Design a protein around this motif. Structure first.
Motif, mmCIF file in Angstrom:
data_model
loop_
_atom_site.group_PDB
_atom_site.id
_atom_site.type_symbol
_atom_site.label_atom_id
_atom_site.label_comp_id
_atom_site.label_asym_id
_atom_site.label_seq_id
_atom_site.Cartn_x
_atom_site.Cartn_y
_atom_site.Cartn_z
ATOM 1 N N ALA A 147 -20.665 76.797 -113.910
ATOM 2 C CA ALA A 147 -19.963 76.705 -112.713
ATOM 3 C C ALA A 147 -18.611 76.592 -113.081
ATOM 4 C CB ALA A 147 -20.396 75.437 -111.910
ATOM 5 N N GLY A 148 -17.833 77.698 -113.607
ATOM 6 C CA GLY A 148 -16.493 77.433 -113.898
ATOM 7 C C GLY A 148 -15.968 78.946 -114.397
ATOM 8 N N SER A 149 -14.768 79.364 -114.532
ATOM 9 C CA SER A 149 -14.181 80.247 -115.199
ATOM 10 C C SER A 149 -14.302 80.296 -116.779
ATOM 11 C CB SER A 149 -12.752 80.536 -114.676
ATOM 12 O OG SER A 149 -11.979 81.415 -115.763
ATOM 13 N N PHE A 152 -17.378 69.888 -118.792
ATOM 14 C CA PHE A 152 -16.572 69.996 -117.236
ATOM 15 C C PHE A 152 -16.891 70.978 -116.420
ATOM 16 C CE2 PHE A 152 -12.651 72.581 -116.987
ATOM 17 C CZ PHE A 152 -13.122 73.574 -118.027
#
Lengths: 46, 49
Positions: free
Chosen positions: A28-30, A39
């Motif tokens: 859930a992140g770039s 994180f």
């Protein structure tokens, strides 16, 4: 009982009448996923 | 000059664009939480004040 668990998030919506049993850490992140908890990547099965 | 828990810095913010992606793609802060909404889609579904 703590055995019954669901999915908190994944890539997108589920096609009707389709089951997903994957346990890969959802990114859930770039930032590219490191394959463990961090994180941006969390365990999809909550 | 960060305030305390008894008296906060009450900042009532109004019409503007809040780029949650800026605070979400950067890990400067230890923990970020947002109620029932992924940060990315936080830039799409919006609110009043």
């Amino acid at each position: 009982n703590y055995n019954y668990l669901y999915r908190l998030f994944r890539k997108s919506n589920l096609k009707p009448f389709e089951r997903d049993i994957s346990t890969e850490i959802y990114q859930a992140g770039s930032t590219p996923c490191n394959g463990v908890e961090g994180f941006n990547c969390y365990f999809p099965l909550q | 000059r960060f305030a305390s828990v008894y008296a906060w810095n009450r900042k009532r913010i109004s019409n503007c664009v809040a780029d949650y992606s800026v605070l979400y793609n950067s890990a400067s802060f230890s923990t970020f939480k947002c109620y029932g909404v992924s940060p990315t889609k936080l830039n799409d579904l919006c609110f009043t004040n």
